[PDB]
Swiss-Prot record:
Induction: By auxin. The lineage of its organism: Eukaryota, Viridiplantae, Streptophyta, Embryophyta, Tracheophyta. Phosphorylated by phytochrome A in vitro. It is found in: Nucleus. One of its GO terms (molecular function) is DNA-binding transcription factor activity. Aux/IAA proteins are short-lived transcriptional factors that function as repressors of early auxin response genes at low auxin concentrations. Repression is thought to result from the interaction with auxin response factors (ARFs), proteins that bind to the auxin-responsive promoter element (AuxRE). Formation of heterodimers with ARF proteins may alter their ability to modulate early auxin response genes expression. The N-terminal half of the protein contains two conserved domains I and II. Domain I includes a slightly degenerated ERF-associated amphiphilic repression (EAR) motif which seems to be involved in the activity of transcriptional repression. Domain II is required for the correct degradation of the protein through the SCF-mediated ubiquitin-proteasome pathway. Interactions between Aux/IAA proteins and auxin response factors (ARFs) occur through their C-terminal dimerization domains III and IV. Changing residue 17 to S: Suppresses the axr3-1 phenotype. Residues 6-107 form the PB1 domain. Homodimers and heterodimers. Interacts with the auxin response factors ARF1 and IAA24. Interacts with IAA1. Interacts with TPL. Interacts (via PB1 domain) with ARF7 (via PB1 domain). Belongs to the Aux/IAA family. One of its GO terms (biological process) is response to auxin. This is Auxin-responsive protein IAA17. It comes from Arabidopsis thaliana.
Length: 113
């Protein structure tokens, strides 16, 4: 049993501005989720109008350096309990359902911003 018809998860990035919702019901597997979110998330920071200040080419490029440079940080989400868990920590079946809030931990907040 699970969303498979109605799922909602928010998405934010510590530091740089990020706000969007998604449906995991679309992806019953963490694999497609990761791909769907990976592609969908990139779309968010991509548009004709947006971080014209350079946050589009500034915060975005810092992410790669920040991730490896700050390889101490890894993606983690909040379950129905509200506890933070690093991606892959809890079973996908439990995650897809409890899936309430998702936020990728990025140490770039110091470099990207």
């Amino acid at each position: 049993g699970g969303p498979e018809a109605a799922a909602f998860v928010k998405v934010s990035m510590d530091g740089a501005p990020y706000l969007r919702k998604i449906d995991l019901r679309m992806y019953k597997s963490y694999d497609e989720l990761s791909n769907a979110l990976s592609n969908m998330f990139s779309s968010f920071t991509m548009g004709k109008h947006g971080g014209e200040e350079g946050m589009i080419d500034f915060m975005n490029e810092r992410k790669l350096m920040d991730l490896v440079n700050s390889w101490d940080y890894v993606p983690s989400y909040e379950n129905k309990d509200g506890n933070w868990m690093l991606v892959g920590d809890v079973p996908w079946p439990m995650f897809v359902d409890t899936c309430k809030r998702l936020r990728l931990m990025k140490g770039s907040d110091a470099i990207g911003l």
